[PDB]
Amino acid sequence: SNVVLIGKKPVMNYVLAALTLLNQGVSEIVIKARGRAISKAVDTVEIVRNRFLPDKIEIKEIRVGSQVVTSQDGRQSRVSTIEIAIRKK
Amino acid sequence: SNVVLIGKKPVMNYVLAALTLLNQGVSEIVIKARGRAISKAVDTVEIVRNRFLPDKIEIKEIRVGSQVVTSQDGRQSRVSTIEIAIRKK
């Protein structure tokens, strides 16, 4: 895969999922998140490139967007999204 | 100035601050935010470029980072940051 979707789980979960990938051959991953989890998506990247692989990781690209979603009622609503692709420097 | 710092105020405040700038000669602004407000910084940009100036605005650049801050105790702590620069297409 190589995609880490930020969910409702505590940050450490994702920085671990993230490190596991990298420190395992994978040279590039993509942190994806939407809604309020967007905050956590950046937190995940900073923690990764900061207290775990400082100087060995670079942000290759960052995309922000909106995605229409269908709620339980069947009603449409949109949420913001972020995509942070990073790779071993 | 041309910088819109996302604070604790409701989104509309910032999308208005943002539109006011643009729809007023300013062709490029920078949405800055840190911490949990990062979510709202994207929400602000999407709402702006979506239900207000669709097709007339483009993301010129997005930077994510960390910033060490000094708390009340005088203790140091860092928070994630985001910088979304956008300009009239």
Side-chain angles (χ1 to χ4, degrees):
Chain A
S1 178
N2 105 309
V3 169
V4 183
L5 186 65
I6 306 314
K8 287 284 65 66
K9 291 184 171 186
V11 190
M12 196 46 47
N13 282 295
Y14 308 110
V15 310
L16 282 178
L19 300 162
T20 299
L21 296 174
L22 293 177
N23 186 286
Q24 184 192 74
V26 195
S27 69
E28 157 165 353
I29 64 184
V30 190
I31 276 71
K32 293 171 178 291
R34 34 222 242 178
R36 192 195 169 198
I38 290 173
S39 302
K40 178 178 297 174
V42 185
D43 291 326
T44 293
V45 179
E46 292 313 286
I47 288 168
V48 159
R49 61 195 274 244
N50 274 184
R51 40 166 138 135
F52 298 61
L53 302 180
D55 196 29
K56 286 174 296 181
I57 287 304
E58 66 165 60
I59 271 78
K60 166 197 169 186
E61 165 177 50
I62 313 168
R63 227 172 306 140
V64 299
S66 303
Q67 177 55 246
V68 168
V69 170
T70 3
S71 55
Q72 23 70 280
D73 283 27
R75 302 303 229 148
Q76 286 183 170
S77 176
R78 50 203 308 145
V79 297
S80 298
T81 61
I82 183 137
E83 225 181 65
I84 306 170
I86 67 175
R87 56 186 175 195
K88 281 177 174 168
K89 209 173 186 302
Chain B
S1 178
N2 105 309
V3 169
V4 183
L5 186 65
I6 306 314
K8 287 284 65 66
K9 291 184 171 186
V11 190
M12 196 46 47
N13 282 295
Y14 308 110
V15 310
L16 282 178
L19 300 162
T20 299
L21 296 174
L22 293 177
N23 186 286
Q24 184 192 74
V26 195
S27 69
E28 157 165 353
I29 64 184
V30 190
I31 276 71
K32 293 171 178 291
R34 34 222 242 178
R36 192 195 169 198
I38 290 173
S39 302
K40 178 178 297 174
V42 185
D43 291 326
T44 293
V45 179
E46 292 313 286
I47 288 168
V48 159
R49 61 195 274 244
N50 274 184
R51 40 166 138 135
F52 298 61
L53 302 180
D55 196 29
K56 286 174 296 181
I57 287 304
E58 66 165 60
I59 271 78
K60 166 197 169 186
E61 165 177 50
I62 313 168
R63 227 172 306 140
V64 299
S66 303
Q67 177 55 246
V68 168
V69 170
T70 3
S71 55
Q72 23 70 280
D73 283 27
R75 302 303 229 148
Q76 286 183 170
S77 176
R78 50 203 308 145
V79 297
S80 298
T81 61
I82 183 137
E83 225 181 65
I84 306 170
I86 67 175
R87 56 186 175 195
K88 281 177 174 168
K89 209 173 186 302

